[PDB]
Amino acid sequence: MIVLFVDFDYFYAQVEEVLNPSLKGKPVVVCVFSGRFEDSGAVATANYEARKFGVKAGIPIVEAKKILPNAVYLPMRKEVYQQVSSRIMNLLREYSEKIEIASIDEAYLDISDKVRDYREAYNLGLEIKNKILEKEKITVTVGISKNKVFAKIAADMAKPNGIKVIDDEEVKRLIRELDIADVPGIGNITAEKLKKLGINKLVDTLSIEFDKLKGMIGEAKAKYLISLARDEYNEPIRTRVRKSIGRIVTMKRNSRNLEEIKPYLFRAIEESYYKLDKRIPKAIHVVAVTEDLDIVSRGRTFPHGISKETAYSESVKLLQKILEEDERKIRRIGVRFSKFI
DNA sequence: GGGGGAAAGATTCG
DNA sequence: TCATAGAATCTTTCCCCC
Ligand SMILES: Nc1ncnc2c1ncn2[C@H]1C[C@H](O)[C@@H](COP(=O)(O)NP(=O)(O)OP(=O)(O)O)O1
Numbered sequence A: 001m002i003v004l005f006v007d008f009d010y011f012y013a014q015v016e017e018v019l020n021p022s023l024k025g026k027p028v029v030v031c032v033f034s035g036r037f038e039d040s041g042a043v044a045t046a047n048y049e050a051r052k053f054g055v056k057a058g059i060p061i062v063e064a065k066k067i068l069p070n071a072v073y074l075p076m077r078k079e080v081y082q083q084v085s086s087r088i089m090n091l092l093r094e095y096s097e098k099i100e101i102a103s104i105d106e107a108y109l110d111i112s113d114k115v116r117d118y119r120e121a122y123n124l125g126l127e128i129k130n131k132i133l134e135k136e137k138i139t140v141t142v143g144i145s146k147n148k149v150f151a152k153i154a155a156d157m158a159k160p161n162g163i164k165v166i167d168d169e170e171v172k173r174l175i176r177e178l179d180i181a182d183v184p185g186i187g188n189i190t191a192e193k194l195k196k197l198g199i200n201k202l203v204d205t206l207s208i209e210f211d212k213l214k215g216m217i218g219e220a221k222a223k224y225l226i227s228l229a230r231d232e233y234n235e236p237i238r239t240r241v242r243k244s245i246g247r248i249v250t251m252k253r254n255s256r257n258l259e260e261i262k263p264y265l266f267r268a269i270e271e272s273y274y275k276l277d278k279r280i281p282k283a284i285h286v287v288a289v290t291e292d293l294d295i296v297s298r299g300r301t302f303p304h305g306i307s308k309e310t311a312y313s314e315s316v317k318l319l320q321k322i323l324e325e326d327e328r329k330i331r332r333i334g335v336r337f338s339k340f341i
Numbered sequence B: 001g002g003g004g005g006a007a008a009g010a011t012t013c014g
Numbered sequence C: 001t002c003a004t005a006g007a008a009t010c011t012t013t014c015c016c017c018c
């Protein structure tokens, strides 16, 4: 194939800079405030100035402030970012309609029916960066290679404001040379199970017995790694359809009182139903984060769609089934709907 | 022995 | 008073027949 991957640079932070140009040059932090105390919550993203000091996505806002006290801290306005990303995705459906929209800021493009070779895709890539830089002022990074995986890897190396091709010879080079931890889908838990087997490159997966690999990282992740090591990984760019819709909130204090948790859970239901929008779920799950940050959940499928009033009652049952079967207090409560009609 | 579905959890952050 | 959020994909155990 010819796959073209685009991922927007420090996206939420950069949108705030587009909307408020006097931020360019200072470190910007976009935050998901939780409401337990002043500055509780986590960082959604920071721009590249703030990353130099270790302020990146996922870390506590308090930790970010101990490092960069006088950085600008903005609250996460996701609805604004979704609107700008939709407009950039509509720009991308003009360069192929085989398009995989994989996050709020990523898309894979099957440009096999649209250019010839890699120098023909590298130039379409600059066409897309320029068209995006002018229509919406956002810089992006482009990866191009023979499949979706090495496309993403390509952009990960080219970041920020970059565009990199990985051709077939470097794909072979990287199957030998790239640390396997840098393959998409390989987190820290997978990455150390692989080192405890002496696997550090993709090619080492061809040298180990399969069932030993399958027993340690699972059948699916083993076949995924081996097919990448054989240069056999070929997977279609396909249109993804949302299979879950939910909402989860943080309670102002840890609790296990049914009457006290209920408002939090009902607002999560009301919000999910708005987002559901004509879609009808047959399946519902209640999700709780305990005071020690474990994640517990109880669900139930139905033979028919779930009305909002049902959802309301079913969740209180599922939520009690949690306070029953578990001992710890609850920190965050949420609901998730699936199995649409 | 499967198929197929469900439930609850684990991993990744695609 | 560290530790958001939403979604996908997968593993394991269970179940219900046949
Ligand atoms: N842990 C998180 N929590 C909340 N939102 C997050 C998040 N991680 C990412 N986002 C939201 C906000 C992120 O901006 C947006 C895009 O995520 P990426 O493309 O993974 N990171 P970005 O574009 O910021 O930087 P780069 O230039 O390194 O891609 O998704």
Ligand SMILES: [Mg+2]
Pocket: A007, A008, A009, A010, A011, A105
């Ligand atoms: Mg990005």
Ligand SMILES: [Mg+2]
Pocket: A007, A008, A103, A105, A106
């Ligand atoms: Mg992204």
